[PDB]
Write a protein that binds this ligand. Structure first.
Ligand code: AR6
Length: 253
């Protein structure tokens, strides 16, 4: 008994390949300067912020902090993983397992680099069915989802230390492509966050500054509103705190 909205989502799912990198930058150029971009850092989950923004804006997309190699990351290592949260509360997994998304996983596996490749998946109108607590929503809230894997810094450290200088450059260019996909699909509202900063062991300050520099440069004014929704259950909030400090100059009113 296939849930409503999932067929259209799977059908509409789209693969972006590394060779489309220049078209993704063209999308950014087309959208730059469209808005006086506002942004904020919150302690919300991805879907809580998405649900909040979706009530004001239809053209809303959220970033999935994706595995490169298995849809939903195989649900291994802990449910404290953002992609697992996304796949337990929405139709995302049925999108990520679509046939047209297959090369993302095949090529990333064949790559044998923990930097991974610049494949991205765009899932349109993924219905969110449940809230943060697993309770049913009064109505499913469909959001667009951009799936891209941050480079796996922790794996790089253990296997190819000579590639450690390429982790942040890889992160930066793939983040640019994430924004390019949103620009290509004319998204006005984005939910970003601490991409690569948990399981993949990237430094949160460096990730926050990477997004800030893109929003001040090649992605300047391309979006109407960006929320950095950073779940951080540690009482000292080292990850939320890093994003708040690196993005404060930007996200002031
Ligand atoms: N629902 C959530 N919403 C918003 N932020 C979250 C959420 N959950 C965690 N965070 C915060 O975001 C930070 C990073 O969340 P992470 O999920 O580790 O993303 P990664 O890119 O480093 O690892 C991706 C792998 O982990 C998965 O297994 C995938 O399948 C991949 O294999 C966390 O530390 C939290 O501060």
């Amino acid at each position: 008994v296939r849930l409503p909205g999932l067929a259209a989502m799977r059908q509409g799912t789209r693969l972006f390949t590394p060779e489309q990198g220049e078209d993704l930058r063209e999308a950014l150029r087309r959208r730059r300067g469209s808005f006086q971009t506002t942004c904020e850092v919150t302690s919300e989950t991805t879907f809580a912020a998405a649900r909040r923004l979706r009530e004001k804006a239809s053209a809303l997309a959220a970033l999935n902090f994706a595995s490169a190699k298995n849809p939903g990351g195989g649900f291994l290592g802990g449910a404290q993983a953002q992609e697992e949260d996304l796949c337990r509360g929405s139709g995302l997994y049925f999108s990520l397992t679509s046939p047209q998304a297959e090369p993302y996983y095949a090529v990333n596996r064949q790559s044998h680099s923990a930097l991974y490749t610049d494949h991205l998946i765009y899932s349109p109108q993924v219905p969110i069915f449940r809230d943060d607590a697993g309770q049913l929503l009064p109505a499913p809230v469909p959001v667009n989802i951009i799936t891209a894997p941050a480079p796996n810094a922790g794996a790089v450290a253990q296997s190819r230390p000579e590639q450690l200088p390429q982790v942040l450059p890889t992160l930066r260019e793939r983040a640019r492509r994430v924004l390019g996909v949103a620009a290509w699909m004319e998204q006005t509202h984005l939910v970003l966050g601490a991409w690569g900063c948990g399981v993949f062991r990237n430094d949160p300050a460096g990730v926050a500054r990477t997004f800030r520099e893109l929003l001040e440069g090649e992605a300047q004014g391309a979006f109407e509103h960006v929320t950095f929704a950073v779940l951080d259950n540690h009482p000292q909030h080292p990850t939320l705190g890093a994003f708040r400090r690196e993005l404060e100059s930007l996200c002031l009113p």
